[PDB]
UniProtKB/Swiss-Prot annotation:
Changing C105S: No significant activity. This is Marginal zone B- and B1-cell-specific protein. Transmembrane segments: none annotated. Induction: Down-regulated in primary B-cells early after ligand-stimulated activation. Up-regulated in bacterial lipopolysaccharides (LPS)-stimulated peritoneal macrophages. The keyword Secreted applies. The gene is MZB1. Associates with immunoglobulin M (IgM) heavy and light chains and promotes IgM assembly and secretion. May exert its effect by acting as a molecular chaperone or as an oxidoreductase as it displays a low level of oxidoreductase activity. Isoform 2 may be involved in regulation of apoptosis. Helps to diversify peripheral B-cell functions by regulating Ca(2+) stores, antibody secretion and integrin activation. Widely expressed with highest levels in adult brain, small intestine and lymphoid tissues such as thymus and spleen. Expression is frequently lower in intestinal-type gastric cancer. In obese patients, more abundant in omental than in subcutaneous fat. Keywords: Apoptosis, Cytoplasm, Disulfide bond, Endoplasmic reticulum, Secreted, Signal. Changing C57S: No significant activity.
Amino acid sequence: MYSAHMPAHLRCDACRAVAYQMWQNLAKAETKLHTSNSGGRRELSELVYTDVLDRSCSRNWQDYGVREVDQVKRLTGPGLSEGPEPSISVMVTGGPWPTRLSRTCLHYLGEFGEDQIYEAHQQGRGALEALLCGGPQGACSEKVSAT
């Protein structure tokens, strides 16, 4: 409970949480600023998408928490369920989790860059998640790379 790092089994969940909140914050800014709809997209200027992304990591992360599911700890919250869940779940929020999620969020900005993240956002929520979390070495990779 003392580490500021995200536990290893939770890195995929954390990555999906970050991708979801980056997408939400950019979409809300496109709406708030009445961004023009040209060519099927609403495109923020570079200063604005950079500011929105950089500040998204400073959000209140009290909507994410840790629960036990089939005897293993998992992180959940907005965006991490494909639909509503049939059964109640009890999760613990706060404590170390906001510091851990904000750290993960800020490090993804530096790893991929705001320009590249915004371009993936324009292709959709799924493309943003694929950029940050997918492919042979992402936190959500489904490939057992040969070693």
